[PDB]
Amino acid sequence: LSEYAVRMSRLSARLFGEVARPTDSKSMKVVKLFSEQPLAKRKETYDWYPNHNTYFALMGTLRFLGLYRDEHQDFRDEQLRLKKLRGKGKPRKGEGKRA
Amino acid sequence: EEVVIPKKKTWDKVAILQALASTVHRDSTAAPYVFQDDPYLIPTSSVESHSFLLAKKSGENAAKFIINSYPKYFQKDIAEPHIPCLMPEYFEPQIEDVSEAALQERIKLQEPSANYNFQQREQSEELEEATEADNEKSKTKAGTWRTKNNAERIFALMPEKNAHSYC
Amino acid sequence: RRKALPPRTEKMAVDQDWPSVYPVAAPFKPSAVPLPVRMGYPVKRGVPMAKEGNLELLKIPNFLHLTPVAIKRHCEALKDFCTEWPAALDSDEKCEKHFPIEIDTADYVSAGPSIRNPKARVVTLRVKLSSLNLDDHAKKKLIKLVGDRYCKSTDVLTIKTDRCPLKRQNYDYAVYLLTVLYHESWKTEEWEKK
Amino acid sequence: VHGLLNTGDNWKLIGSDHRRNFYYSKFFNLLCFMEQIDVTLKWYKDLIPSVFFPHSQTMIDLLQALDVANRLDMVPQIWKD
Amino acid sequence: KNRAARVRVSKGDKPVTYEEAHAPHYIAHRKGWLSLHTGNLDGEDHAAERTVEDVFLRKFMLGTFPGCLADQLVLKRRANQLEICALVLRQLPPHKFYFLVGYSETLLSHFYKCPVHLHLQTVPSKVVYKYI
Amino acid sequence: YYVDWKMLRDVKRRKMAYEYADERLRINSLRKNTILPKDLQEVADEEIASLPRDSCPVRIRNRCVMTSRPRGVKRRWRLSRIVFRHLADHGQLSGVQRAMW
Amino acid sequence: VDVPKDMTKPEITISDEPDTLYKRLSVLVKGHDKAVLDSYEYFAVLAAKELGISIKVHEPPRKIERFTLLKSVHIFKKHRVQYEMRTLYRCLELEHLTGSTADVYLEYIQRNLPEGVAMEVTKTKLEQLPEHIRKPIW
Amino acid sequence: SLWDIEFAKQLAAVTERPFQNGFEEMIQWTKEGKLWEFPINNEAGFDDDGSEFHEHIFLDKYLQDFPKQGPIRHFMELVTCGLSKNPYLSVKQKVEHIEWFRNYFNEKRVILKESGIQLN
RNA sequence: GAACAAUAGUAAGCACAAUCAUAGCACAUAAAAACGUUAGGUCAAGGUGUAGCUUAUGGGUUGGAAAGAAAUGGGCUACA
Ligand SMILES: [Mg+2]
Ligand SMILES: [Mg+2]
Ligand SMILES: [Mg+2]
Ligand SMILES: [Mg+2]
Ligand SMILES: [Mg+2]
Ligand SMILES: [Mg+2]
Ligand SMILES: [Mg+2]
Ligand SMILES: [Mg+2]
Ligand SMILES: [Mg+2]
Ligand SMILES: [Mg+2]
């Protein structure tokens, strides 16, 4: 290790774009975060979920517009119809406890 | 001195595809390409051919009506090169009460252009020689006493330019 | 009202050409294919299934649009678009004297709406050092300046750049690195005499 | 004129399917009796099952052409068509 | 007992399709994959988006062809165009087949922002491989 | 509708994480460097502690995109193991087979 | 016998710019099944011989990515179900090749890529020197 | 000029047809923009606002108004080295990061004075 | 409901077997293993029938989830 080698390493850092002056291993962290993509901005992170609200809303609108037919909501509608025909339905909001 | 470099060739992206379509000619036994060539879906007569083609076109129009009816479900883009025709189209005016924008916004979509002109005229906002030209062109492209009313609108309010008005 | 039609096999001639029937990629529609083709595990008394109503033939990729006669026709069409390779550059050694710099770049294709692969930004520029006008002292300063990017056995210098968003910007930065190494290798400074 | 249709671009000069089957109906009306059977049956299988399906004016005329040319073998296939 | 993707042995009268008649350990041995796409390779990205697109295609075709859809779809991905291959029974008129074909084409093209092909083969009944 | 309120809260948490992702980077750059004065660093800890809670990346939970199972999830497919097995045994995933060697 | 006439209409414009030369172009195809890769290799080699390229094709060794999952829903860790993904490689070496030929060959191969495979192209090209290095010194 | 657009649309309705060939479908989709442009490059359509490598790598011209000899220069050369190394971030957002740091050190002035070193 | 020098058994099919993978056979391993038994485990992967809430058994924020008197299972490191 010589001062010539120090100048060669510093010159190589200046031409290739690294940090020329000596820097701590703790202090190379800020270089690492500014060089890498942050974790919350990665497409795997924010685009992790499909837009379930738009999926459900689109497919429900197609169900009521009669281009797609949904057997599962047909099953729920028939079961709720049978429950209301039997007489045990969903009460109004605010009538259940006091009455 | 012995370096020989040939010159490059510049082509449009599909010229090679018409070069392949030059070799691939029409098929003698096949159906038209739009219809499915499954024998249940092969049209037996010309009435059936027109029926199937207009059924597919009505499906295209119905699905595009769904897209224009609910544009918020198609706002998310997955394709990164961002095809502009695949976005839903907005048929709504952008600014409601501003005459100088709402005029041309309702012209570029008959009744809406007339309502925008009436809203501009009721607030004493003077339509220039370009907005009146666009409104007259929109009235002529769509649509006889209302024609004379539009003529009185063209000439009575402003001295609108000939090269739009007589045209 | 149900209607049933015979397929195109009965109307197919003996000497008709196949690329006119199949221009592009196809899902193996079985009505237009005259070959009786069987795929599927048979029953102990049974036979493999025929081409109608079989999903395995629908699953399989087809080479029906890539028949060899169609390959001859299509390549005779692409013959007008190709250009000739120079006769003087036939050998690797003459390529080494004439064009010393080689540049590795990559393009990737995948099935999906997204084109961009983050590994496509890379540019790998390789130079044989014997083809340059480096002196003795400038050459030693070049090795001690670049370090690990130079091979001591095969005498080649390899600079890989990644940092630029575009491959053209990476190419410009790599050729800039090469020319600034060339200009700073010849400089003799005050601390070089110690 | 069929070569003229085929030369530059095939489909962009005829506007509608209606006038396109008018074209092919009168085209076979000419080609049936002013050419011979060897090319008539060969363009029969090229035009009729592919391009458009026949109307009555082009239905009657193959019948009168085979009656003129005394061709009795050709009847069942065109009947099935 | 292993119960995944298997049909149970009844008295001997239930019809079965070839895909339902093979256990999952016959995948890439005797039966193949119902979807083919790039993202499940070794050093390739974007598998989960293709997976959820695959799922939404299966449910949308199952509800779009109610009862006249015979069996499972074939989903091919080849240079951003998506080929959807179906076996449909002869139940609905061809008017309604072409209406649903054009509707599904335009809707999925504008929804996944990619070109779509709908390829159909229309059959008299469910194809029976065993039993019956 | 998402399938579960935990899924809905994780969507909102990812939303505030993307909304505040740059400011956390900018403040943590000042935090994680020892060249900076300690009088500045304790202040930087004060504005990193005064940020909203749900904007932090450690609160982001990787759940299944089908049924929102909190664990047993493969990172490549973003799917739970039961749903992954259900789609894999039906042959709906390319290149996946039961393993035999 | 219905032969349409004058089917050919090419558009080729020759620029004055020197064409780019590539030393070598590597096409590595990865797939799941071997037969598709074999037939695709036969297609690519036949197109190469008709284009006059004189290529060499070799098979890189395969790698298999293996993982283990639980067999049951709730609690059975002794019994597991394992899954396997198989990828296979075929590599085409393209030697002494030009720019327009590179483009048309690559797009002909790319449009005829099947559904279940991927590939990487690695282009190493010929370039003499930049204009600021040739024989100046500062 | 609406009538020129109407003339173009009436001529294009005559010109367009239902598709008779698969290759015709591919050329129409490529001219419309639906299909990829072959041969594929991964940066098709993204020019990064026409920027070059010198605006991405060398950030020295935005370090002009800084204390030249203190730890501020240390911190900023580490930050600009990270921004030069980062491939995923645009040059306008790098300018926004540098201006955010400038704004931060502009609002906080007194704490640099009681730090013990005088910085401008 | 069977006697092979055969005395009421035919039997489509599912298992076993055969085939397939561990890049050449073979062996070995893996994979497979029917109908059923234990009302065996899972309403907390997910959906669900039935029975219960709807200013709460629902939806959000903050702060906390201790600990070993004791016993025991499986491991890691040793006792050289
Ligand atoms: Mg729930
Ligand atoms: Mg966590
Ligand atoms: Mg039996
Ligand atoms: Mg073997
Ligand atoms: Mg054995
Ligand atoms: Mg086992
Ligand atoms: Mg066995
Ligand atoms: Mg119990
Ligand atoms: Mg529950
Ligand atoms: Mg244990």
From TrEMBL, chain A:
Biased composition (Basic and acidic residues): 92-99
Cellular location(s): Mitochondrion
Metal-binding recorded as keyword: no
Any single GO CC term annotated in Swiss-Prot or TrEMBL for this entry: ribonucleoprotein complex
Family: Belongs to the mitochondrion-specific ribosomal protein mS33 family.
Name of the protein this chain belongs to: Small ribosomal subunit protein mS33
Disordered, as annotated region: 83-99
Coiled-coil residue windows: none
Full-sequence range covered: 46 to 144 of 148
Keyword Disulfide bond annotated: no
Keywords: Mitochondrion, Ribonucleoprotein, Ribosomal protein
From TrEMBL, chain B:
Gene Ontology biological process terms in this record: mitochondrial translation; regulation of translation
Compartmental location: Mitochondrion
Region of interest called Disordered, as start-end residue ranges on this chain: 119-142
GO terms under cellular component: mitochondrial inner membrane; ribonucleoprotein complex; ribosome
GO molecular function, one term: ribosomal small subunit binding
Superkingdom in the source lineage: Eukaryota
UniProt KW keywords: Acetylation, Mitochondrion, Repeat, Ribonucleoprotein, Ribosomal protein, RNA-binding, rRNA-binding, Transit peptide, Translation regulation
Role description: Mitochondrial RNA-binding protein that has a role in mitochondrial translation.
Annotated family: Belongs to the mitochondrion-specific ribosomal protein mS39 family.
Protein name in UniProt: Small ribosomal subunit protein mS39
Automatic annotation (TrEMBL), chain C:
Superkingdom, natural source: Eukaryota
Any one Gene Ontology BP term: mitochondrial translation
Covered range of the whole protein: 92 to 285 of 366
Organism of origin: Sus scrofa (Pig)
GO molecular-function terms, A-Z: structural constituent of ribosome
Name of the encoding gene: MRPS35
Domain Small ribosomal subunit protein mS35 mitochondrial conserved intervals: 117-187
Keywords recorded for this protein, A-Z: Coiled coil, Ribonucleoprotein, Ribosomal protein
Entry protein name: 28S ribosomal protein S35, mitochondrial isoform 1
GO cellular component: a single term: ribosome
TrEMBL record, chain H:
Domain of life of the source: Eukaryota
Location in the cell: Mitochondrion
UniProt family annotation: Belongs to the mitochondrion-specific ribosomal protein mS31 family.
Protein name: Small ribosomal subunit protein mS31
Native source organism of the sequence: Sus scrofa (Pig)
Originating gene: MRPS31
Region of the whole protein represented: 262 to 381 of 381
